Ligand binder design. Structure first.
Ligand SMILES: *[C@@H]1O[C@H](CO)[C@@H](O)[C@H](O)[C@H]1NC(C)=O
Ligand SMILES: *[C@@H]1O[C@H](CO)[C@@H](O)[C@H](O)[C@H]1NC(C)=O
Ligand SMILES: *[C@@H]1O[C@H](CO)[C@@H](O)[C@H](O)[C@H]1NC(C)=O
Lengths: 49, 49, 109, 117, 120
């Protein structure tokens, strides 16, 4: 009724996947030139949505 | 800047959409994109902006 | 964000009665999950129609429904003297589910 | 597929109401199946209170989100709803019903009448 | 020698492929392994300290004058293909073709590998 949030997908990644490749890692993505060190500020994202 | 009851609008055309220029405006507070990844902004080309 | 219904409906037994329920918001989205209930005083509410026009088991084929736009209708054919009950509609919205105001049916004779 | 209700019928102002629903004939640990609560104050239409899903996801009516808490015990087939700060105006019959998507509530119990005074 | 580690960073951040032989069956697992600083077997073993998520798992017949063994490790479209040959015996001069052994449906990224030795 209020939304099923138990299904996730990846939005942010370093590159593209190869056929049948699986990646379960949740390592924080750096979109900029500075080490956010897990702090989800500007140019720093959690891979899954 | 205009008041919210009477917001302003400008048409953008015939230019190169370099979004790095506007990443030096603030410490950043709100930044959200709909239908487009923050990583693909400096790539896609649009008809009406 | 309120489901709107008529206060009451009436007619003679053997005639067709229509009970309408209309949305007043876009929050209902597809509005494709409309339920109808028949409530008798002193008894638990019974499901008569679900998903706009489908019947549950244990329900007379005299009861059917349809939708047009954002409005749903419950049709009671071959009206019986035993059909005197408070009818309610229900549907989903963006953060909750709603029930209608309730329509009181009276059988004339 | 039945649901029975029990609990207090008379509650004093500002106190907490606890109602327990016991069900049989089905499990609540199966996908697509939950249990919710509805109330009907005299002269009024049915009002949605709370809903708990098979995965312990808990949802509440937006106007009562701060007042309601719903929990379940799958070993006894019981669902418990507690409502705090009962107002004198909170007089209604409470109902326990099975929740599904294609049909919102079904197999409604007879209900329990609660009066605040 | 009695096995190999295949992977990238070879720690509990990514999935790694671990192949270890035995006196009986060979045990192959793909998990988020946290590998030992210097992996070895002790005859128990000291190959990994811990692991998180596991996906692929396989157990079967062992892969293994001196003996000579040859293996080919190829990884295409997520399938880890192993070819092998065993003969009696630097390298000998002659011709001998290797034949298919196993084909593992893993979906793993491999850029580096390490061997596993048993000590006594
Ligand atoms: C081989 O190792 C496995 C553990 O991976 C053990 O259970 C099995 O008994 C061992 N077989 C022999 C012959 O030692
Ligand atoms: C396995 O992956 C899931 C999903 O990312 C994670 O929640 C879980 O904690 C991981 N397992 C371990 C032991 O970390
Ligand atoms: C493995 O991942 C790295 C990035 O960490 C990438 O550069 C490399 O090409 C990938 N290798 C394969 C076979 O996917």
């Amino acid at each position: 009724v209020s939304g099923n949030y138990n299904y996730l997908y990846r939005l942010f990644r370093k590159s593209n996947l190869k056929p049948f490749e699986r990646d379960i890692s949740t390592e924080i993505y750096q979109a900029g030139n500075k080490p956010c060190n897990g702090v989800a500020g500007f140019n720093c994202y959690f891979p899954l949505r | 800047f205009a008041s919210v009851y009477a917001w302003n609008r400008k048409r953008i055309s015939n230019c190169v959409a370099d979004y790095s220029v506007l990443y030096n405006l603030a410490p950043f507070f709100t930044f959200k994109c709909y239908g487009v990844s923050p990583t693909k902004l400096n790539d896609l080309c649009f008809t009406n902006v | 964000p309120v489901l709107t219904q008529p206060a009451s409906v009436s007619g003679s037994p053997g005639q067709s009665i229509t009970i309408s329920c209309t949305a007043t918001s876009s929050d209902v989205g597809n509005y494709n999950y409309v339920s109808w209930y028949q409530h008798h005083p002193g008894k638990a509410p019974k499901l008569m129609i679900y998903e706009v026009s489908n019947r549950p088991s244990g329900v007379s084929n005299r009861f059917s429904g349809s939708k047009s736009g954002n409005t749903a209708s419950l049709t009671i054919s071959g009206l019986q003297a035993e059909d005197e009950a408070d009818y309610y509609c229900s549907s989903y919205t963006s953060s909750s589910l709603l029930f209608g105001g309730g329509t009181k049916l009276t059988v004339l004779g | 597929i039945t649901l029975k209700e029990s609990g207090p019928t008379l509650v004093k102002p500002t106190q907490t109401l606890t109602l327990t629903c016991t069900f049989s004939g089905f499990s609540v640990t199966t996908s697509g199946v939950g249990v919710g609560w509805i109330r009907q104050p005299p002269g009024k239409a049915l009002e949605y209170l709370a809903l708990i899903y098979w995965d312990d996801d808990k949802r509440y009516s937006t106007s009562l989100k701060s007042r309601l808490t719903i929990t379940k015990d799958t070993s006894k087939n019981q669902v418990v709803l507690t409502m705090t700060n009962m107002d004198p105006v909170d007089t209604a019959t409470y109902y326990c019903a099975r929740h599904t998507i294609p049909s919102i509530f079904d197999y409604w119990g007879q209900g329990i009448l609660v009066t605040v005074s | 020698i009695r096995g190999w580690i295949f992977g990238t960073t070879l720690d509990s951040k990514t999935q790694s492929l671990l192949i270890v032989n035995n006196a009986t069956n060979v045990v192959i697992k793909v998990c988020e392994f946290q590998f030992c600083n210097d992996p070895f077997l002790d005859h128990e073993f000291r190959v990994y300290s811990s692991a998180n998520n596991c996906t692929f798992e396989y157990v079967s017949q062992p892969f293994l004058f001196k003996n000579l063994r040859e293996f080919v490790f190829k990884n295409i479209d997520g399938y880890f293909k192993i070819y092998s040959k065993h003969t009696p015996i630097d390298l000998p001069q002659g011709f001998s073709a290797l034949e298919p052994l196993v084909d593992l449906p893993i979906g793993i990224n491999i850029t580096r590998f390490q061997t596993l030795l048993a000590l006594h």
